[PDB]
């Protein structure tokens, strides 16, 4: 997902003016990790009785 956004703006953004700071988006990556760890039937609640 990050890559699709990056390549999308990689054309629209003007050249000689941009940088990976302005190119990369970490929102979807962090969202993917969070949506895995929470609300996934493998990220099970610790069963410690």
């Amino acid at each position: 997902r990050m890559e699709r956004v990056v390549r999308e703006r990689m054309t629209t953004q003007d050249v000689e003016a941009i940088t990976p700071q302005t190119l990369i988006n970490i929102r979807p990556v962090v969202a993917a990790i969070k949506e895995f760890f929470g609300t996934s039937q493998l990220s099970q609640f610790m069963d410690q009785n």
Partner: protein
């Protein structure tokens, strides 16, 4: 094809808070990720690291 982007060197920092503190204050026990990005422009020729 006139420009490209690359990644390297995944690297962590120390965790931002210890286990018991994270468990108490409902924080998620995590640590940051740092990745060396590198933009290159083919036609003119640079690296933006």
């Amino acid at each position: 094809g006139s420009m490209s982007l690359s990644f390297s060197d995944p690297r962590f920092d120390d965790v931002k808070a210890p286990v018991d503190e994270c468990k108490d204050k409902d924080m998620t026990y995590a640590a940051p990720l740092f990745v060396t990005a590198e933009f290159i422009n083919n036609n003119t020729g640079e690296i933006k690291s």
